[PDB]
Amino acid sequence: SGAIYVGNYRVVNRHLATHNDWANLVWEDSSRDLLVSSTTAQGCDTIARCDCQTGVYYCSSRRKHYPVSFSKPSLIFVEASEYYPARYQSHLMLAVGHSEPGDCGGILRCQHGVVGIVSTGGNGLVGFADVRDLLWLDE
Ligand SMILES: CSc1ccc(Br)cc1CC(=O)N1CCC[C@H](C(N)=O)C1
Ligand SMILES: [Zn+2]
What we know:
Bound molecules: ligand A1BQE, zinc ion
Strand order of the largest sheet: 5-4-8-9-10-7-6
Largest sheet: 7 strands, antiparallel
Assembly: monomeric
Shape: globular
Radius of gyration: 14 Å
Number of helices: 1
EC number: 3.4.22.29
Number of domains: 2
PDB class: hydrolase
Method: X-ray crystallography, 1.8 Å
Name: Protease 2A
Order of helices and strands: EHEEEEEEEEE
Number of strands: 10
């Protein structure tokens, strides 16, 4: 679990969105596993606007932050699950690192701010859904 709070928005993994998230929906994309809902209170997370490939992510299954090198956002195959059929998830970035299904939502940050959230994993790898291109989260 985990969310990004920026302005009047809440950013979560689409496969983990609540009833409240869907009743206050702003935008959603199954192909990115992202969902954005509106909030009453203000959010103080800063989104990075950069092409950084290094950063730190929170891993809840270890209660630890890990530094990582990560790939550029791209279309990557993701095996079927209870939430989606087997497909290409777009805007996905991979790193060598530990993750388990309950790790989705952990924030990945660089020196510029929030880069994205844990969305995939398996075989000593961790996948992050990028949010750096969502320029509207600030305006
Ligand atoms: C950090 S998630 C994870 C980590 C290790 C292992 Br084994 C398995 C997982 C689970 C996982 O990758 N998915 C299930 C939830 C939907 C995800 C998606 N974005 O399509 C795919
Ligand atoms: Zn950066």
